[PDB]
Write a protein that binds this ligand. Sequence first.
Ligand SMILES: [Zn+2]
Ligand SMILES: [Zn+2]
Ligand SMILES: [Zn+2]
Ligand SMILES: [Zn+2]
Ligand SMILES: [Zn+2]
Ligand SMILES: [Zn+2]
Lengths: 295, 295, 291, 296, 295, 292
Amino acid sequence: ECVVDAGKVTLGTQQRQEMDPRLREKQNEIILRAVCALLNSGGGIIKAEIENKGYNYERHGVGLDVPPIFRSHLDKMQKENHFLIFVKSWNTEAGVPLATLCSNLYHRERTSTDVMDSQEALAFLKCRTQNVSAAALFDRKRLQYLEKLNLPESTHVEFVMFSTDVSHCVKDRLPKCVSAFANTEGGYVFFGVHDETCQVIGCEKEKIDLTSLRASIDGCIKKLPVHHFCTQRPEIKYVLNFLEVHDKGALRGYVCAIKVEKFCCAVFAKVPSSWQVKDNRVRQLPTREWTAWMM
Amino acid sequence: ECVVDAGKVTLGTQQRQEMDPRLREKQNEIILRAVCALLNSGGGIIKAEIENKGYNYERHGVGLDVPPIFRSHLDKMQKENHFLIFVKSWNTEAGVPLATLCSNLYHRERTSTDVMDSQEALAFLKCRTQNVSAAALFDRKRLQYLEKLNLPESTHVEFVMFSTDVSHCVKDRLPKCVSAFANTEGGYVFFGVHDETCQVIGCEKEKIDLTSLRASIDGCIKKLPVHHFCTQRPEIKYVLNFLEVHDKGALRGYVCAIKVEKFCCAVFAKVPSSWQVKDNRVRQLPTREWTAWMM
Amino acid sequence: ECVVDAGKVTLGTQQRQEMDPRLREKQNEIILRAVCALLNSGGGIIKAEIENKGYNYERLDVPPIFRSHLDKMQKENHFLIFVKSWNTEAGVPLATLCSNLYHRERTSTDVMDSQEALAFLKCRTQNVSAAALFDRKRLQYLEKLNLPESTHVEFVMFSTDVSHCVKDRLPKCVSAFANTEGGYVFFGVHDETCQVIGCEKEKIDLTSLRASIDGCIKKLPVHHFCTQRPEIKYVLNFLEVHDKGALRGYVCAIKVEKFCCAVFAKVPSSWQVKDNRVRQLPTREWTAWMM
Amino acid sequence: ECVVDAGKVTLGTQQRQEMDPRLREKQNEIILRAVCALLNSGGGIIKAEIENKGYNYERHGVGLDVPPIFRSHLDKMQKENHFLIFVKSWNTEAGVPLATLCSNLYHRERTSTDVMDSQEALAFLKCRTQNVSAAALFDRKRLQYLEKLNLPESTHVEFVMFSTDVSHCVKDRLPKCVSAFANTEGGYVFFGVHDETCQVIGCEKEKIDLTSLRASIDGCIKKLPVHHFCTQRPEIKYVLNFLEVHDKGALRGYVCAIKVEKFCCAVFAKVPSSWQVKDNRVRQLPTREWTAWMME
Amino acid sequence: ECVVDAGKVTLGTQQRQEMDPRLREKQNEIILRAVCALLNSGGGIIKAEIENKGYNYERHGVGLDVPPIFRSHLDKMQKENHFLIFVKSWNTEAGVPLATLCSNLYHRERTSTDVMDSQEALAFLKCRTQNVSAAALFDRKRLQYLEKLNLPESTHVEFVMFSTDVSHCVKDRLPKCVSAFANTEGGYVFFGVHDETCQVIGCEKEKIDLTSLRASIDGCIKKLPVHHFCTQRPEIKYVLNFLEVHDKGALRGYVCAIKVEKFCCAVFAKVPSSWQVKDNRVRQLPTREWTAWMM
Amino acid sequence: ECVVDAGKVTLGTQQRQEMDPRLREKQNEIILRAVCALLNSGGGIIKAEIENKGYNYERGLDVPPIFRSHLDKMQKENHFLIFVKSWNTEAGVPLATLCSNLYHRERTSTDVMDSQEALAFLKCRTQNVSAAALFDRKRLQYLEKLNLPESTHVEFVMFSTDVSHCVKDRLPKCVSAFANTEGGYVFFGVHDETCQVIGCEKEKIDLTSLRASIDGCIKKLPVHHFCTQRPEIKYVLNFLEVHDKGALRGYVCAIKVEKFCCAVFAKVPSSWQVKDNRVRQLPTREWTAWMM
Ligand SMILES: [Zn+2]
Ligand SMILES: [Zn+2]
Ligand SMILES: [Zn+2]
Ligand SMILES: [Zn+2]
Ligand SMILES: [Zn+2]
Ligand SMILES: [Zn+2]
């Protein structure tokens, strides 16, 4: 019922292994978005001119990773210098409606926060329609450098390390964490503790601004996509604490701790990756339409 | 030049090994006090009726418990039911004048506080007539239970454990420490840290009163025997800090830290154990007379 | 079908937050006992004169399942609670306040709720290194054990009072082990660090405390389903804890075998209304009423 | 025999405690340099107008952070708005010739590298006129992040931490170390290991250039002041190794190790801080003149 | 329907506790094999002359290693100097067909590799008819002696110690591990690391040949029984790495690591312990017949 | 005034670096023995045919520097000669000794005394609680980290592949070092850098036989006395059991050595004479007497 053009794409297992990884995954995500959109809206056809025109089919085989549920719907087609994909309508008999690429709903089991799949998210929204030492560590005022904490990573605490850039690290890794906690029992995340060793590695004091980064944490947490089922639709309840990290003499850095309360309904990390084809192009459906269509 | 009576004493190696150790050491200390007293003054004779009357001579303790320098000066005598000791005058030819039983002057080298001998104390008084991480630990406010400190025992810090009784433990062990520090570079002593492991244990909060124990520390520290050679003649400079020791939730106990500044002259732990015969009686000479006689 | 008087009670969220916690939880627990008792036997009404008589409603610690059954009423200086009969439709019969049935999953001993206890009794009607640590005899002070807390071993610390600590914390442990795979509990090991901190030798009598644990363990409420009805099989070992070649204290270890049926810590907190007052039904009546 | 002007200086214990610390120690170092120069050359007088002119003497304080040996030579004087210091000639009878401010000759005894004082440097130059696990750690190729090394800090190994700036940290902290090793048994210094815990941290890989920093280490070590007593006056024998520091997937940083051989004679960190008065101004004597003047 | 002779066996709880354990477990295994065979084929009787012919007569007990499911089928009989066991045909009402003594199918949950029971193996084969730090540890090259690894034992890594004999230790313990991994998510096993402490010990270099042991593990890994249900029937995918273990100076030993991929179907450690009586002799059915009869 | 023949020697710095190290040190130690003997007895000359006969002079090697001041090298055709002056008594040490074999423990290292240290030592001889606790323990756990640190009184040493050879080789140094300085304890099976317990496998040790072996090795130790009463060295051996999980895995082999009145050697001191035939190392009596 729809054409969709990926454009210039390189086909072939060996050829894609030997191609610039960034462009490889760019092309791949274009194909995955197109297949998701065609799946969710009706039947469709994808087209893309082959870049390496001296490499022909039967040198490609299965390649450029195709999700297994999606693979059952598409069908490969090769015509002259162009490549086509026949996308059947998304089956509704696999108890889950509308093909979603990534739920962006995270939840933490034992020691791992993990993004829910289609089924896990389905049962999750279905469910939502109807420790002491950790608190002590959060209440602490002054950590020592290379201090080994005795609080172990669990469903309520997550030790994560800083990257080279503090702001980018917390802005990138925080949404996953606060989503996972809010959706499952809540808990604490500590930035600057090394998970495998549970030692305190504060980020250098010269490489952090506390008030500015706190405003950044507030912005990032408020910008989180939220969907409610209840009457009194509240906000995410978080509290930020900067723990001081000294070593010998005087202050060295900070460990950046965020406590996230369990959340009544459901919270996303980013707008869920699911796609429509509206009028003329692939357009990812927004949060309301996604969670309502999942119902 | 003097009689001196030890009284009822049990003689014999086997017989004293098989006797109540407390009474054994009582008798022994009486004999040593008598031998010191006779030694520093004119020669003398000690007498004591043997308790174990089935004792034969030459079955004694060659040095029952007598410093070797003393053994060379005395001479044993056995007559009927009594035992006598011929005490020659203390030889001034050893370079040491008074013949002291224990200097009670302590000093800390590397990892050990140690009481100076006669020679070491002599050269010490002769000399007196002519770290950052430790400070950080002292300035700290809140220790965690079983925290392993990275500050190691040294010439400036001494980790000592509490006994069952806090007041008796600190009142008994503190004078040695503050003397040793005052005489050599000063330093810190911490009560409630286990030396071999450098972990924080601390005395239980229910078994300590802070203001009362601090008054006790001040009283005990003022009471230390001090001798000056200098002009102004100052007092010992100490600072007491009670470090809180929490575990999980909330406060569990305290670590009792004392910082002791290096001292101008010399500081004793107790009045030096050296003995005179004045009005034909054993009488330990006081601190002033001791340090003056040492010259 | 029954009157019941709580008496002098202070009402109000802010006012109870600003009230002595001891008396607050006394009052609260009286209300919980009364609502449980009326809940189990018919319908009833609770009345209690308000203490802070200048504070009225909209100017408490109540379980959510109970909340659906009661209805608050304010009349002059007295406060009333309308207690409906316990709804047998939540697959669980008779409202129980606390099962006092413990079981240890993974690293935590936990008291079973009404449902968990129900399914548990229904099921009951139809490691090597740990044993090595128990068989030992001489631990060193601040020795870090390599045996980790699990469904079979529980490291618990001593309190300031040894007798009170073991006498208070032991029933929970032996119940939890008896109900799930059994296991060992060690007193004097610090759980978060797995180090040995024996209680001081001057503050413990071994034979007397052994008699005390024996009494506490035998007096534990037990209910049987089988033909032969034996007692709980426990073994006590006092591990010596030395430091610098000198006995310092003891670590007090108790091994508890897995138990055929069910073992309680205390008589289960569930309440009746008899012609006189609220009266907690005994163990037999509770375990029979659950079925 | 000489005037010397410190200029605008703030006098007073309380007043200097309440003054900008940087300007405080700038002024202080001017006074110390002047007193050193006057001491070494002959007799002299220092003058400086007081800044806080309402804070006069008996507040100016005996405290000015001045080495005690120097205090015995100077004598303070207060006149109107100016302050003077009478500097006697340096007393040679304390077995040490010429007043030195800082020898800049380092040596590592047991667990501490330390700058020698006048006496220690004297006896040191006088003496100069007449481990396996450490080598294993140096030969290693890839340490793991937060690895606890079993090699302990000793007279032969020194664990030092990185600062925020790697280049500045090694360029500032290395001369002390290589001097201390060169003067006493030699040894290894490791950058990126935490001394109190003997754990491996290392500077982040994004904040270091390997070849450029190696050239920087070569320049800094060659630039070191050296004085010889022997026949064949050789150079410092050093070797630099970058240990890789991985964590989980892949490398995070490097630990920067320098091995320094024991040195025949003496090696400095910087030109020794000792001062002359050359006709019109204070002028710190160079290395040659200092080490030669120390011998007499 | 069948006789079966165990032969000379000692009966009696006290008497077997007081008998040579080797012969005791030999006899016991003969009885278990016979009862398994009679169970699997059709009702039969076991016979065995008592060794201690004056010690048996209701002074035996229910004691003796007999699985309870089996015991519900047996019936003991005592006649003069001989002992008989009446074995009913295997129930089959327990949802599980054929009495199996040991599945020899292993699977690793959490921290334990474990042999599946009859039911677990049944549901497992039924299901089969229809980490980063670990990989980092495997990719390494040079471990230090007594190094504490931060990778913890999990469903994917198994730390096992060497015995006194390296070849016998790995040849005996490897099949269990590779089976358990092949049946559940796969994973790594490390030989020479102490599980309770996660330290590196490794077998001494003088007590190992790398190429010979690599051929040995390859042989042992190929020799293990495998059964397939799928179309293409591949082999188990394993990779062996010898990690060098130095201490101070130079090489001390090796840690022997094996990575085992998750396997399509089911993998055994040995031919499954289940027994038939063919003709008139006890004969353990082979792997194919066992897995097929399980249905 | 004595000839001495080293024999076939391969000469040359590059050539000796490129030669079999075993034969290298064989030859070298022969030269050192000859130089020691000639030094101690009088003047002498050493002769040795060069092996690599195309590698001559203009193409120094392993000799103590004090010896170097006495020797003088000479190259003549296919033979090489060494002029050995009589050992100068003008240095503080009489006689030239190659190795005192008298050990003493300073701090964390046991060390063989040099000529001067041994001289002052014998001259001087002519006129802790946690360690004792560890010795008494009898039962260690595998990979237990001991809190007793290596010091002048305790020495942690590891086992080799062969237990008997390891203890028989490393024990004399230790017991000598302790006997000469404060005494102390040595533990076999503890890893020094980590202070963990690594017991030797139980299958690879016989307790009574090895105890007889250590007794023999300790009695065979060279001893020299200065005092009136001349007793033997007082040692006590304890085998500490090392369990892991389940049951016994191995043993840690502990030896306590009391401080000794006089001096104790590890082996007969390496010092050499020239008798009418060859180099002949003087025995212990002659060495310690000659030092006086
Ligand atoms: Zn909501
Ligand atoms: Zn004074
Ligand atoms: Zn029962
Ligand atoms: Zn030179
Ligand atoms: Zn397969
Ligand atoms: Zn002797």
